Amino acid sequence: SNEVLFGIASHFALEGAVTGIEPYGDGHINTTYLVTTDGPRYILQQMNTSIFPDTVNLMRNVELVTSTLKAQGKETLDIVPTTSGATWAEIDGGAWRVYKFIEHTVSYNLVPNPDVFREAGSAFGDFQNFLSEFDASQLTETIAHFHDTPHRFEDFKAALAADKLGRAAACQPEIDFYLSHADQYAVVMDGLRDGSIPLRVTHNDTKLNNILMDATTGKARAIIDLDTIMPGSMLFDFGDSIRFGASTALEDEKDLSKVHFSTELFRAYTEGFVGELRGSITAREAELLPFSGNLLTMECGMRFLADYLEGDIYFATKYPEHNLVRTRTQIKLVQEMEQKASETRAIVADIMEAAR
């Protein structure tokens, strides 16, 4: 309520007298408010400390990345300090932060067309490019092992072994798909480990609703939602974007005849992404762009299936078989990626040469 909210806002060095504070946006993790003043506007968020208990480390990650982008004249989340100079405030139990409102933007939920998907690729390619000289090792793992696929596979096997709901009996083909792909899961972790794949900043929630684009030009403006900034390989981010974004269907589509991996959307994202990162991407990274799609789609699928086997404790579900329906789309997508490897390899090689 306003009196509590107005009081909360008083903790921050706003550059305008507060005039209103109301719920804003469609975020589901933090609690987001729009602060209107006699002047500029702000985003005020109560941070979800159940999901992110370590506020100091999370905000440290956000400060490091945003400071680097700001230092280079790049638009990003701009933290407004507390009146005491901190990046966030402890208030009667809660953890609160303020960002300058990024004005004159729009954003998308579902991918509307290849052109917008290309611009999403451009947004994250630009993000990667301007962080190419940032020492990613300074960042902490806010969610440990987040895209450590071998670790996720161990978790999957534990859920399978426990079979607490006796659900394994009903999904043998899905289980065997993940078991049979076992020797593929370590490709990127091994690469990061031996230095053949660069350690880079990773965003880890590359969904389009985190890419603000200009309200008039439609061009990428800024990457937001920096809660999950961590070290990793950019292949984790690229692969996941391909996972959700190059599908012709929703993640929980029941009719598998409608679920396809679209090479047109793959080409669109890759054009935008590589177009901005051509001077930094390594040969090994380029080599793995198509496979990163397989990897992150398999990782996501195995997590859905593990959750199904464990009684749906991690992902929200709407009906008993929701996670099983989800895992099946991810399986369909990977098999198509496997079968179109010739095409995607050729697509990447062509885009690499064109970007020059």
Ligand X SMILES: Nc1ncnc2c1ncn2[C@@H]1O[C@H](COP(=O)(O)OP(=O)(O)OP(=O)(O)O)[C@@H](O)[C@H]1O
Where does this chain bind ligand X (CB under 6 A)?
Answer: 24-30, 32, 43, 77, 99, 101-102, 107, 209-210, 224-225, 227
Q: Which does 318 bind (CB under 5 to 8 A by kind): Mg ion, ligand X, none?
A: none
CB 228 to ligand X: min, Å: 8
- Rounded distance between C-alpha atoms, residue 101 and residue 72, angstroms: 19
Structure token pair of residue 18: 């507060």
What is d(CA 146, CA 43) in angstroms, rounded to the nearest whole number?
27
Binders of Mg ion: how many residues, by CB under 5 A?
4
251 vs 343, which CB is nearer to ligand X? 251
Residue 169, C-beta contacts closer than 8 angstroms, at least 6 positions apart? none
DSSP string over 196-213: SS--EEE-S---GGGEEE
Among 192, 7, 205, CA closest to 94: 7
Task: Tell which one of 29, 34, 102, 179 touches Mg ion (CB under 5 A).
Answer: 29
Which residue, 26 or 183, is less far from ligand X as judged by CB?
26
Give the residue with the Cβ less far from ligand X, 68 or 107.
107
Q: Smallest distance from the beta carbon of 42 to ligand X, in angstroms?
A: 8
Best CA proximity match to 207, nearest among 145, 117, 281, 304: 117
User: Which residue stretch of 14-22, 222-230, 253-261, 326-334 sits at the interface with Mg ion (rule: CB under 5 A)?
Assistant: 222-230
Draw the binding track, 223-242, toward Mg ion (x: CB under 5 A; -: no contact).
--x-x---------------
Query: Which among 147, 155, 325, 347 has a CA at the least distance from the CA of 239?
Result: 147
Q: Is 210 in the site for Mg ion (CB under 5 A)?
A: yes
- What number of residues does the chain have? 356
* Closest to ligand X by CB, 224 or 281: 224
- How far apart CA 38 and CA 17 sit, in angstroms, is 5
Binding site for Mg ion (CB under 5 A): 29, 210, 225, 227
